[PDB]
Design a protein around this ligand. Sequence first.
Ligand SMILES: COC(=O)c1sc(-c2cccs2)cc1NC(=O)/C=C\C(=O)O
Length: 131
Amino acid sequence: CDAFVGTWKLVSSENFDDYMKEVGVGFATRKVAGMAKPNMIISVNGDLVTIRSESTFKNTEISFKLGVEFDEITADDRKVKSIITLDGGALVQVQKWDGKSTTIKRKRDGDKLVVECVMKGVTSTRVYERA
Ligand SMILES: COC(=O)c1sc(-c2cccs2)cc1NC(=O)/C=C\C(=O)O
């Protein structure tokens, strides 16, 4: 996942509130998520990949190996089982909890890192560029 390594800053967000509503995120948390201007910092050390999200409002970090299930507490405070794979050159994360699932796809497109979050056909698109 060398293509993904770096510090990325948010440049656009589309349909994020509706996505969060579909997942079940509370009103106040959606408000915070909507106004935050996060950086996404991706690094690799051998077979261990780390993805950090940082803003004045919230900091999250996951460290994982491709294709190995791990436990995660999400930014919106869900406890999920996550599996991340490299699928068509994209990093694809599936989160499962309470019999539900959502997919977060991170892809490289030109100079952009495009993040697509989908649940039950509701999709948010958040685009990042190098900081
Ligand atoms: C279902 O809930 C989510 O998808 C939440 S809550 C949240 C928060 C940030 C700060 C407080 S809560 C961020 C996200 N998600 C993305 O932020 C996912 C895409 C990204 O990395 O840009």
